[PDB]
């Protein structure tokens, strides 16, 4: 039923080369600071090293394209289309690991060696501890956006209903840190449980299996994945403990014991050591033979690439004066916090054309009927916030003047 | 007298894939709850990292089955069986780690660095402890249900000690793997329910009978199987209770005054899995089934097949809490705490189409192997009786194979 | 427009080596002391495994150089220029990790596992505390000095109202120097300008800028002169959590918690902060003490040194150790701290070892006008400094060059790997 | 001019195994102890896997040994010399580590998380701490002793010692370095309190590889192999004056409690982390075909330097002897004691060689060291100031490579 594009896709010789050039985010890792004299303006955007980088690249239309000799194609039975076959992600700034927190974070005991009884429960014995997140590198690249999955509250013991959710992920979503992929603000009502940077978010995780069966492969040109984390600490939560501990699992307590304590565990999660050697950026990918039968087309003449780089997630500490005073004191400072990311996206593409016979047209108008439309032969994805990246006037056919165009001049034997 | 099923079991040139789509398992990691008035009425189910997963995967009777073209073979002399030729174990969620504890574990001192004298009393010093377990992947597969072994408590036949006894049995689904305190009947072997975290105090830990299962004769129970186990100890505590072997005296030197009554030297270890990463991941990879070790080659007799999943590395436990009275400040007794554990599976075979030619010597040798294979081929099933995660595909084949993911990789890895 | 040097530069048989010998550098690994008269001569220079070496190595021209037989020079229409073909970076000294600190650094409290309500009040809890930092090996190679990047304080419009003080933050773009500090696990900053206690990292960089080599915009130059090739290996983790003291200059929103009373009303500091760690050092990673062959450079300058000079950028903290010295003031048959004093000094050792290959190149017409327009002073220094306020480590081998290359180890190296 | 041994230096097909049998070394591995009068003699000597093992390893004199048919050379034009062509250090005793320490080590605060102010003063803060040392395997091979490189105090707003590196020749029983540097401890830190004791009397060294490799002939390095590894443990700072005080622009002064700036003078423990089978360097074979010098080999003046560092056997035994035997036990009816061993085997495989006399040759070994005809006839050994383990192989030389280990191994890799 569905076929690879090589099919009907006819690949020319030429080649053009885009990039964006350096891309710069700047804000605070925690949370965004909106304007208090114009509440529909940000002040300061959330910039964190656990969010996805989701690029929506803008290419210039082929079939309106000032190529200098356009005789290669028929415009009254052809249609022009860029395929992607090389990508270099670029990636700024040195390798570092920051850490998030919570001024109140709901702990009780450190429950690893020594927590004996009775217990000590007041009503507000929240701490304010940190932590540094599991470590994730990831890329993913398509011609349509990514599918993420994440746990939210379903439809009816008092415990939330679970429901598993698809959702598209956007630009500024963040990634799962260790808590799991789940709605947070939702699913956990007292705010305290997780750090601040996502406990009113959701954490998404890409939905691998149902991008990969799709039919077309549109999600997943190609991807790249690496996570690792482990058990830093070990600690239960204060509050009621929703469900208790069957009576065949242990043997009750008495005097001293008698109050059984919360088993309500949570454990924080580390990201460990991040090297040089297991960077998944600043290499080219040469996207040659795609798994899916999308093998790298580009219809609507755009594409998505999806990052999470949590090895570049330091977070910068600021301190400015407001009194100069000749011995120290507190009260004459203050202490801001600031991350900043730096991306350079660079492309090969391929310029192919497509003979648009009965067939085809068939076969283009089933899958996807907004192709058609467009050549002449209201976007669904501006709800959606995005990174745009603009290459309608970027591009260059001059491949060996830029370095991935090098690179892909002497990989293909160019 | 056992040969291998390339002897007599003909290969065909048409294949098939089958995919059982998601499988989600929802439920409390450490425990299950009952319906209060009823008995097999679960209200959640106990759903951990630390189960195996032991898929029952029914195939569709070829010989049944509506294929466009049955030329290809002669029922009268002929029956029909399909061999696994590739899978790939699909595993959705993050990775990451959960942990397990106690309220009321047995752990008396740390005994790591400092455990001085005198022995303080009591008669329960139990403590509300968790821990991250060993770390354990594995992959079995085979048309047999798998074999483990754990240890339990033998006969009745100057020690109290209860004797231990080597036992096999099938692994069920939902079935606890070790976790760094050793295969073993813990709710007969340790009678106090405290001496490890309560989702496996009361059950039982298995560990695969990989000797066992491999020098079966037929080989049904491991085409091929994949494991990565690994621990350390992160801390090192001792038993309260009675010490029921005491140090002999040739040991020591007795004590006096303040260290006159020994310590106990019950120690026990905690384990930890360490580190989970990608690279070192079983899943979500293909294998192919070209060549296996024993004599069944991939043959899925009686139209089924186990698969048998154990993976921690995707063990995080997630957080829920509800608010039962809002109020503008934060009070604990407002808030309901619980714990949920998921699991996301996506089982991908193909298949490849065999026909067996009903000789004389043939169905003496089938007869020998399994009399049940003859039987339902017509030329009650013993395992009702156990618990395995059921996957139809009955209704799931399909000769299409370049539609689908792992019908892509098998035809580019084949040449075909 | 650019063209790779393969194409209008012409290699010869003829190959030279050169080596700098020993090169020391000795002086106090926290700051450099001044002479109190002499103000500005320095008693004891700032000598730190966390700094960057930028060695301008200075070559002979070859276009004057005393070759044995010159008649196959034609300097009538052509022009000789030296190619780099094989370098050793040589360390001294054994691996090993050095320590920061500072005696008022500004942690307030330890947030890991125990930082209950209520704070502590007060106006200086400073602790006297250090670290190990990130473990960085680099090392940069070009005819031209290298870039690196920086944050620093930017511009604060002033037509628009700040809700948040916070100094505005912009990236900047400089020449890296020998002395240089690398970044350390608190990024690339200008440390001084940016924290303005002075206390928020140790004394080695808290008055000082920490520079990131700007490999992205170096790679994307035109002509390619700043990276023939380079080589890079980094790594830390977090050791500890921390939160910093004084006032929180971004209040937390309202909708990321629940408010706290009695003990937990006065919210706590969420300025965060880690300490780094480099973790291990080990022989199996080291970058140095090992040959380069500089074949074919990604860039169009595939390893020609105009201007018969070479710059070696070089980081390598795997041997960072700080030496503890000790003098006795006062000699007792009991010992008295006050009858010593303690010091602190740190060393680095290196041995610089290339082989260059000859050029020449045929001034034809159209490539005069190229290397023209890729850089006038070629032309006019053939006949045919802007740098000079920039400070580098000096390695002058205008008069070290030899032909007979078996004669030192990275020679025999080179007619081993090259076959001859 | 050098040229390489190649091009004067004749080989033969005639091969010797020599080997030196089990070397043991026994002793007190933070320090030598004395005869209890007499003073000059040792009754423990100190013993350490952190000490430099340098063999001089003592070869018969070819043109003096008794070979059955000496007609492969013309004695009056010719001379003999052994090159190396193979080399294998055999380590006894099992992988482990020791540590070291001092029972008043200069170690004043804790200073990784908290170390509040103010300092609380004292004279005397000295504490009984330990630590285990850098890991480092080293093994070095040439005809010519090693030379090391260290820091001591040089000549002529700061009272801080002139800082100079020194060469010197390593010899049997010098320290490595540790973590703390190649330096001088004696001299360098007064106070004798900064390093642990079983260095801070003694000149911890390092190899000058840059100083050996450069050398013209090359008969320092034939062949090297080295792995060090460390991290910081802990972080601490010293009691005492600050030398050198802290700028002013670099801090805003304190107050109160404040008021008195603590010591910054820090300082790490290392850790040489785990030791493994995997990353040793020792007990396999050493095929000495083509050096990168000039001097391929060839063992001038009839003998060869082995040099060795291995702090992966590092292990120190305790050991305990019973004064009064009482029911109960009393610290002060014991005596403790520590010892470290080093276990070594020594295998070589030579190659006889021979050397023409001719004007050119003699001008050109006169030219690169004046003994080596002197020696052949055609003297006081300055390395007699320098102490070396001395292996004399004059009696151990065998023809039957086949009858030992390593002479197997030699034909199985050469084809012979």
């Given at each position: 039923k569905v076929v690879s594009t090589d099919e009907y896709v006819s690949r020319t010789s030429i080649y053009y080369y885009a990039g964006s050039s350096r891309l710069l985010a700047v804000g605070n890792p925690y949370f965004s600071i909106k304007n208090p004299t114009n509440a529909k303006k940000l002040l300061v955007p959330k910039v964190?090293?656990?969010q996805y980088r989701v690029f929506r690249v803008r290419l210039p239309d082929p079939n309106k394209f000032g190529f200098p000799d356009t005789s290669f194609y028929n415009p009254d039975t052809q249609r022009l289309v860029w395929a992607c076959v090389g990508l270099e992600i670029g990636r700024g700034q040195p390798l570092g690991v920051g850490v998030s927190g919570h001024p109140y974070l709901n702990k009780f005991d450190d429950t690893e060696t020594?927590?004996?009884?009775?217990?000590?429960?007041?009503?507000?014995?929240?701490?304010?501890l940190s932590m540094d997140y599991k470590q994730t590198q990831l890329c993913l690249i398509g011609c349509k956006p990514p599918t993420g999955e994440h746990w939210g509250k379903g439809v009816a013991t008092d415990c939330p209903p679970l429901e598993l959710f698809n959702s598209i992920i956007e630009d500024g979503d963040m990634v799962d840190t260790g808590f799991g992929c789940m709605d947070f603000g939702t699913l956990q009502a007292n705010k305290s449980d997780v750090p601040i940077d996502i406990c009113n978010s959701t954490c998404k995780y890409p939905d691998y299996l149902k991008m990969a069966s799709e039919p077309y492969g549109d999600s997943l040109?190609?991807?790249?994945?690496?996570?690792?984390?482990?058990?830093?600490?070990?600690?239960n939560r204060a509050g009621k403990l929703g469900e208790a501990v069957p009576d065949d699992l242990y043997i009750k307590g008495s005097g001293n014991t008698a109050?059984?304590?919360?088993?309500?565990?949570?454990?924080?999660?580390?990201g460990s050591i991040v090297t040089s050697e297991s960077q998944?950026?600043?290499?080219?990918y040469w996207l040659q033979r795609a798994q899916g039968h999308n093998n790298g087309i580009c219809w609507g003449n755009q594409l998505?690439?999806?990052?999470?780089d949590t090895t570049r997630s330091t977070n910068m500490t600021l301190c400015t004066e407001v009194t100069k005073e000749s011995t120290y004191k507190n009260?004459?400072?203050?202490?801001?916090?600031?991350?900043?990311?730096?991306?350079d996206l660079q492309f090969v593409f391929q310029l192919c054309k497509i003979t648009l016979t009965a067939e085809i047209m068939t076969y283009i108008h089933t899958m996807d009927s907004n192709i058609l439309e467009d050549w002449q032969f209201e976007d669904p994805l501006n709800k959606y916030t995005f990174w745009e990246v603009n290459l309608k006037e970027k591009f260059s056919a001059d491949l060996d003047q830029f370095p991935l165009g090098r690179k892909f001049?002497?990989?293909?034997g160019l």
């Open positions: 964190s090293g656990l020594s927590n004996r009884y009775p217990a000590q429960p007041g009503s507000d014995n929240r701490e304010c040109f190609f991807f790249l994945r690496r996570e690792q984390m482990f058990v830093r600490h070990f600690f109050v059984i304590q919360s088993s309500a565990f949570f454990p924080t999660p580390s998944l950026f600043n290499k080219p998505f690439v999806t990052v999470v009260d004459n400072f203050k202490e801001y916090v600031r991350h900043v990311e730096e991306y001049l002497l990989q293909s």
